Amino acid sequence: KEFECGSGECILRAYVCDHDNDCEDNSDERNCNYDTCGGHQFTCSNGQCINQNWVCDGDDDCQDSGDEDGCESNQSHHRCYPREWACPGSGRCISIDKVCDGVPDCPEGDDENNVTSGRTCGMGVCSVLNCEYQCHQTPFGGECFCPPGHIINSNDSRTCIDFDDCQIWGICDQKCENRQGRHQCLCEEGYILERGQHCKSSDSFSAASVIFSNGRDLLVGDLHGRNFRILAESKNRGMVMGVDFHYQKHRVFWTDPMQEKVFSTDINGLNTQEILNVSVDTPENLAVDWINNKLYLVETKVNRIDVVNLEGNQRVTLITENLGHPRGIALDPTVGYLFFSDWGSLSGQPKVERAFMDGSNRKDLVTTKVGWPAGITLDLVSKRVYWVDSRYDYIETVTYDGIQRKTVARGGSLVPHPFGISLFEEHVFFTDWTKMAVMKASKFTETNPQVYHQSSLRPHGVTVYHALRQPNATNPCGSNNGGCAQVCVLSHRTDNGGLGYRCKCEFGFELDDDEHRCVAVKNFLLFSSKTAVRGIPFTLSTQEDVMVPVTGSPSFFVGIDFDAQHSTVFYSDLSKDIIYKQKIDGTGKEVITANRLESVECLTFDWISRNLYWTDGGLKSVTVLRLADKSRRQIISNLNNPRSIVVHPTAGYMFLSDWFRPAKIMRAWSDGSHLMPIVNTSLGWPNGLAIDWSASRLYWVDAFFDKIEHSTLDGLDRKRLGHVDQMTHPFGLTVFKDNVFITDWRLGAIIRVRKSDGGDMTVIRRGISSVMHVKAYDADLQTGSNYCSQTTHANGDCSHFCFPVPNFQRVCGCPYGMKLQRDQMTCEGDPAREPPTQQCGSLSFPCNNGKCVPSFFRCDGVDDCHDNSDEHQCGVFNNTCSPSAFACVRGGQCIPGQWHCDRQNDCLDGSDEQNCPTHATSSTCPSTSFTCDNHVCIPKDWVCDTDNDCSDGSDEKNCQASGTCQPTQFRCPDHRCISPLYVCDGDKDCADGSDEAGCVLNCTSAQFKCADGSSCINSRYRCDGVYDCRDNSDEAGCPTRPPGMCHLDEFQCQGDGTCIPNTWECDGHPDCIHGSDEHTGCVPKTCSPTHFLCDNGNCIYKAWICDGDNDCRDMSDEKDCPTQPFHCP
Amino acid sequence: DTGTRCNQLQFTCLNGHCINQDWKCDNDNDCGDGSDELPTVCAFHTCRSTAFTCGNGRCVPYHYRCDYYNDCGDNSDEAGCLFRNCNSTTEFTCSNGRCIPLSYVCNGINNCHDNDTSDEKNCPPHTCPPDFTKCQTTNICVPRAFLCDGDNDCGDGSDENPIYCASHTCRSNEFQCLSPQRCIPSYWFCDGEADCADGSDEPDTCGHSVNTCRASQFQCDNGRCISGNWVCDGDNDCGDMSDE
Amino acid sequence: XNXXX
Ligand SMILES: *[C@@H]1O[C@H](CO)[C@@H](O[C@@H]2O[C@H](CO)[C@@H](O[C@@H]3O[C@H](CO)[C@@H](O)[C@H](O)[C@@H]3O)[C@H](O)[C@H]2NC(C)=O)[C@H](O)[C@H]1NC(C)=O
Ligand SMILES: *[C@@H]1O[C@H](CO)[C@@H](O)[C@H](O)[C@H]1NC(C)=O
Ligand SMILES: *[C@@H]1O[C@H](CO)[C@@H](O)[C@H](O)[C@H]1NC(C)=O
Ligand SMILES: *[C@@H]1O[C@H](CO)[C@@H](O)[C@H](O)[C@H]1NC(C)=O
Ligand SMILES: *[C@@H]1O[C@H](CO)[C@@H](O)[C@H](O)[C@H]1NC(C)=O
Ligand SMILES: *[C@@H]1O[C@H](CO)[C@@H](O)[C@H](O)[C@H]1NC(C)=O
Ligand SMILES: *[C@H]1O[C@H](CO)[C@H](O)[C@H](O)[C@H]1NC(C)=O
Ligand SMILES: *[C@H]1O[C@H](CO)[C@H](O)[C@H](O)[C@H]1NC(C)=O
Ligand SMILES: *[C@H]1O[C@H](CO)[C@H](O)[C@H](O)[C@H]1NC(C)=O
Ligand SMILES: *[C@H]1O[C@H](CO)[C@H](O)[C@H](O)[C@H]1NC(C)=O
Ligand SMILES: *[C@H]1O[C@H](CO)[C@H](O)[C@H](O)[C@H]1NC(C)=O
Ligand SMILES: *[C@H]1O[C@H](CO)[C@H](O)[C@H](O)[C@H]1NC(C)=O
Ligand SMILES: *[C@H]1O[C@H](CO)[C@H](O)[C@H](O)[C@H]1NC(C)=O
Ligand SMILES: [Ca+2]
Ligand SMILES: [Ca+2]
Ligand SMILES: [Ca+2]
Ligand SMILES: [Ca+2]
Ligand SMILES: [Ca+2]
Ligand SMILES: [Ca+2]
Ligand SMILES: [Ca+2]
Ligand SMILES: [Ca+2]
Ligand SMILES: [Ca+2]
Ligand SMILES: [Ca+2]
Ligand SMILES: [Ca+2]
Ligand SMILES: [Ca+2]
Ligand SMILES: [Ca+2]
Ligand SMILES: [Ca+2]
Ligand SMILES: [Ca+2]
Ligand SMILES: [Ca+2]
Ligand SMILES: [Ca+2]
Ligand SMILES: [Ca+2]
């Protein structure tokens, strides 16, 4: 029943102690039952718990607007603090004692004398104002100031009312209070107060040290910069990028993106272990969880944030949605928060995010005027975050809720390009790619950086090694692993119903229905792209991956298929020309095959008989290989442009698509015999194939007609699915349950449609680069039995290959160079018909691995065979190195030529960097350009833009804030001088967008302008079927097909009303369902007597008939005449 | 030569019948004379790809492998088979590796079908009736229609063995078909249905004429024969309403 | 064109 408020209204109970009046009496707030609020909630001044996303949304959700409190920074700076004065011109709050001191401290000279506007430093009115404490002269009149604890009253400019000066920024380190004697600073336990205002760490916790990346090797130094010791040197041309430490374990961690590894040592410099080396191909930054003894990592080849134990086991992914470009990370295990930043998501907006320490409740903490947030650190006692930016070039701080945003340094002269940041006591230590040094700055307000240590190479993440940097706390997962089966990851202290932890499962498993139990994963979507092979769940809500992504240093992954009986996946790489096998957890990468592959465009698995089929676009064939033994034989030999294959183990059929001009889809026994077409009418570019295991129906897609079709295994009952919007160039297709997951090339995205009609196109992924394939991993589908895998039998009783055949029968075969025995079951040597041949021919070094490379690549310093065979034991008196490589003077070692004299020692003897011709001749860069110190040539407009272009910093030195620039440059307000190419480009390159404000969208006569004037797009994208404009004006007004008819230049099939292009009409091939396009009203083509033409191929010279080359593409020039020259040469 | 030719996919026997090529040299006398299994033909023949090849060279369908029925001849379809465990407390290990619950032992048929008939070392309470003949020591109690009939029904029991067929071409109370060998009783001879494939049980002239039948049976116009009480009884016995 | 590379 409704509550009876004192006013008489019947009030619903949901507002009882909602921290709102709800009526006049406020009796609903008389007694309150609220809790401490959740981690995903903000607490108002009244104690109200409101949603975290409502903070700084622009609406005063809490009474007194406690939820905004100046979310914006660089305000007009009105009502400056007591003992501070506002400059009328620039709005700059400056110290009162600096007014009329002789220094034009404000940029406009507002605190000094000038005659042009009658504001000299003369005293006029303070004699009558008579301030109760002190009256001082200003260029704009007399002003009054008061002792601490009061604010000058503008009501009369005489009095001062009481005020808490403790609120002002930088008054004291750590916390402060007004309890007695007005303001009174205080220091947290473990710290001791010094100077009255400063909090210093007690000497009971040992001296502090700061470890920073020199840019090539990890260093360590004292808190003043007297003695720097190289703790660890990166070997194999590596480079230390991120650094973090675990104090209790006396451990220092770092990441090496050029070696694609992460490491760990003691501070003594001993006991080094290589933690991770799989799938970590560009680790940016790092963070340890000293409370749960865990390591949080950031990867940016496939953007994700991971967590792993200090020994590198039980890796689990936490955040993988929408990251785009994550760079910074920081932790507060005592509270349970995880802070990270990215300089651009998959969407357009850069941001700084906050989340629980296992993902979960993500929230955009800072979203306005962000730029490129490059690094995050936390003040653990003041509960504030500190981050830097490399485009707007500032260092800012906000509280844990992002409320009070205050700049601590701003300007292209002070912080030109920060990367890393960490604070200690009264200082913040940040790095710099432009000033090339680790900088020390105050944490409250800083106007001049001090060079802590100046490098000759770009520095990287910095952390301060000290005990207080990692305060103690209780560990919720500290016993029984928190009841979690595999891995216990801390959440926010209030999450999981007060337990403070949530259970995860390693990549091979997933959580049970009742939680706390990890069972093997049954199914997930598996897709491939040029950068990585990934596995994602079908449920869109659980957007996190369920298998360690497969990545390589060169990589182009095309064809993929799995193996459920061993949790193993197969994948082809188009740059190695190699096929690999790898488990779901990332262990056991072994080459399946590397010999004689040109471009394998697909794989499939005949799981019952353990056969792997693949299609080669360079050899123009499909090969089958067994996994019990490395048997292989080209079962089909003379295709034209074959693409995705699929095999039906129980039915015994295999299906593959050729997209040459007479495109067709063929069916054959799993042996490779009976290859006949089943669909070859009205097909253009049949990229994808799949089988609907629930009904034994074959699905395929087209890229010429942009259609999806499905038929039975015989090609009968051919039906088209509905129109799918924005489907322009589908390549991959798979079928699961009642949905069809399709890869597309124009979108570069994975879309899902219903299996029974066109369906609702719901996008699963987007912006996944050159995405190629997709498979539906399922641990059930891969099951069954037939005569090739039957108990009481060995692989169907056939020596080597056994192949299923339609109508439940087995047919044996076996590899190249072996024919079938008389009994049709076993095999015998066949040297006469299929002689053995070498791994690969001459002019090619046969690697120990199957692959082989040209002999020019042997002993040249680059790992070409991908197993180091071509570099094995070089430099000896015969195995000389190639001239493209530099040979060390002794020792039989040699390196790529580009490493010779590159200021980095590689040769063991050190001859790599000796006697180099260091001096450059009397030569200059062109006169319009600029010459760096190291003689790099750059356009003059790049000078002083706060981006290091010379890689030396010579184009950014002597960059004073004097306001001048070059004539051609565009100057932002007090930020930097932009080159004129970056103004009016649609992106705010200044701190305020002034380089983009008020400029015309002048599309250059070859671009289509969106109707709303938001942007111009290239004319090719006009009306192609994909919405390229935000207003969808791109696809508006496009020419369309007249109702039921065809376009002006598309012949119509009289059989079914479809349209085929005019160039297909009377081409000799019956495209239409009934051959209407090959009516009698046209005559076949003929050829000259010196040439010959096949059934549909172009005419060719009579001289190469029967020659053994598929000149016609129709093989009829050879099948009409074997004519074997069966005689000795 | 009889003035006809078989279809191209049928092997033509020396006797003139046509059988599918898949039955050639399969250890099965399909032609009715063993012409399709002669070593003259099987020595120049290879089994089709989809089928097994026994050691002797004969061809069997693959589903005859490890089938608990030796049909390759040489036991090659059973050789090398790794059969499952047999639960002795539940099933009896037959001589061929089969195992079935022991309630089927001595039951009345050699369920295991092993060549020694270890299952059917009969232990019954005996006293089977004369019609349910005891097939000697292999005590299959079977209806008499399965004896003097040319095809196996008792293994090595009574069956079609000429021990009893030597008396009167069958038992004393039963006739024989004369092609193919098959024996039926008196009440099945001229009973209105041709049990004998040649129609010898329903001859051209039952009795001394078309419908003479027997000294105790009525004469129907279509040539059938019915008993004395069956005439005019109100039901169809002659088939053509000769009685009614 | 429909070329993977
Ligand atoms: C967090 O908790 C750990 C718990 O071990 C604290 O470490 C311990 O701190 C105590 C008191 O500072 C140390 O005792 C002193 O150690 C020094 C050096 O050995 C010794 O000379 C003194 O006589 C005294 O025993 C103790 O060694 C140390 N133990 C360990 C394992 O490190 C740590 O201080 C706490 N830190 C914070 C910020 O709360
Ligand atoms: C100043 O004047 C305003 C309006 O008269 C009044 O509300 C405020 O309390 C005054 N403040 C002081 C400190 O005099
Ligand atoms: C990677 O790390 C493992 C375990 O530390 C190590 O044994 C192995 O040699 C390393 N190399 C690779 C790439 O597997
Ligand atoms: C805009 O484009 C036109 C060509 O359409 C060009 O002539 C002109 O100089 C450009 N500038 C403006 C703002 O008119
Ligand atoms: C034999 O079968 C019975 C059926 O209930 C089963 O309980 C028993 O475990 C089986 N014997 C063995 C040893 O498996
Ligand atoms: C029956 O099988 C046994 C065991 O293989 C064999 O010794 C015996 O000769 C066989 N007898 C016949 C008739 O096959
Ligand atoms: C906040 O803490 C209190 C005291 O421990 C309660 O656990 C309360 O339930 C917490 N808040 C939430 C939302 O769980
Ligand atoms: C020395 O031997 C290597 C072996 O790989 C190359 O053949 C090289 O070309 C040789 N040196 C010269 C000068 O040809
Ligand atoms: C130096 O070389 C550049 C071309 O690289 C121009 O020719 C320039 O004028 C030269 N200037 C001097 C001083 O030699
Ligand atoms: C900026 O001012 C300095 C000092 O007067 C020089 O005049 C310089 O040439 C100026 N450049 C521009 C573009 O204003
Ligand atoms: C094409 O179809 C659209 C509707 O989709 C309009 O009817 C348009 O007028 C048509 N275009 C032509 C040229 O007939
Ligand atoms: C081929 O013959 C036809 C007639 O059959 C025409 O003459 C045609 O022009 C000829 N073309 C060539 C290339 O020979
Ligand atoms: C053996 O016979 C089969 C069935 O007729 C096939 O013809 C097979 O090709 C034959 N094998 C040989 C070697 O000719
Ligand atoms: Ca209320
Ligand atoms: Ca708000
Ligand atoms: Ca001054
Ligand atoms: Ca298209
Ligand atoms: Ca090499
Ligand atoms: Ca070098
Ligand atoms: Ca620059
Ligand atoms: Ca910058
Ligand atoms: Ca711009
Ligand atoms: Ca478009
Ligand atoms: Ca055509
Ligand atoms: Ca030819
Ligand atoms: Ca036969
Ligand atoms: Ca058998
Ligand atoms: Ca029995
Ligand atoms: Ca019989
Ligand atoms: Ca009869
Ligand atoms: Ca009757």
Side-chain angles (χ1 to χ4, degrees), chain A residues 643 659 685 687 729, chain C:
Chain A
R643 203 144 268 172
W659 61 267
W685 305 352
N687 283 332
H729 204 125
Chain C
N2 241 21

Side-chain angles (χ1 to χ4, degrees), chain A residues 685 703-706 727-730:
Chain A
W685 305 352
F704 200 104
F705 300 112
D706 312 340
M727 186 160 250
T728 299
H729 204 125

